[model samples]
Target chain A: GIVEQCCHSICSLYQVENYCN
Target chain B: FVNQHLCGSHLVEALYLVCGERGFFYTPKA
Candidate 1:
């Protein structure tokens, strides 16, 4: 979904691996 | 409704681009 995609994108963009999970 | 609860705010307009600055984001079932 968009939420997950957005979350992953943001997490990747910020290098926040913990959030990516 | 699920997306709203998980992502913080429900996406109102699909065309709008905004940032979530509320500090934290939850993805319990990701």
Candidate 2:
């Protein structure tokens, strides 16, 4: 019980092409 | 807090390159 869930929580972060300006 | 391992740092750097912080503090403040 020390895996999986955490490896999945990261999916919450936003995703885009580039971030800097 | 999330116990997950975030993406690689290179991707984070990409974010900085596309949407993160800035510089050039010598610009006109008017």
Candidate 3:
């Protein structure tokens, strides 16, 4: 749950790595 | 956890008051 949320937020915040995998 | 996930980091909280860096704040401050 943490990673999933972080990945999504990081991507949205930076607009780069959209894929969490 | 769910609440935080829904809200942005901005919603995390205010910059905790420090000795010098922070002194006073309000309901919302960036």
Candidate 4:
């Protein structure tokens, strides 16, 4: 469940990365 | 992959670091 909760945090990081270009 | 949810998790894995701008940007930069 921690991983599940951290998922969005992980994805927010990626989303920020994806749009970084 | 189950949702707990799509707001996170699999999206990160699916996107991976492979999609970095240079194809291998640092994890922090990616």
Best by DockQ: 2
Which CAPRI level is candidate 3?
A: incorrect
lDDT, residue B3, model 4 = 57
lDDT of 4 by residue, B1-30 (tens): 345545344444544543655442223222
lDDT per residue as tens, model 2, A1-21: 112322333422244331123
> Which has the better TM-score: candidate 1, or candidate 3?
1
TM-score of chain A, all candidates: 0.22, 0.18, 0.23, 0.25
Better-scoring candidate (DockQ), 2 or 4: 2
Per-residue CA lDDT of candidate 2, range B1-24, in tens? Answer: 332234334334444454544511
Poorly placed runs, candidate 2 (over 4 Å): A1-21, B1-7, B21-30
Stretches off by above 4 angstroms in model 3 are A11-21, B1-30
lDDT of 2: 0.32
lDDT of 4: 0.42
Instruction: State the displacement of the C-alpha of residue A12, model 4, in Å, after optimal TM-score superposition.
Output: 18
Candidate 3 clashing pairs, residues 3+ apart or interchain: none
The digit string of per-residue lDDT tens for model 4 on A1-21 reads 334334445545544455332
The positional error of residue B12 in candidate 2, measured at the CA in angstroms, is 0.5
The order of the candidates by DockQ, greatest first, is 2, 4, 1, 3
Top TM-score: which candidate number?
2
- Best by lDDT, which number? 4
State residue A19's C-alpha deviation in candidate 2, in Å. Answer: 7.1
DockQ of each: 0.06, 0.15, 0.05, 0.14
CAPRI-style quality class for the chain A–B interface of candidate 1:
incorrect
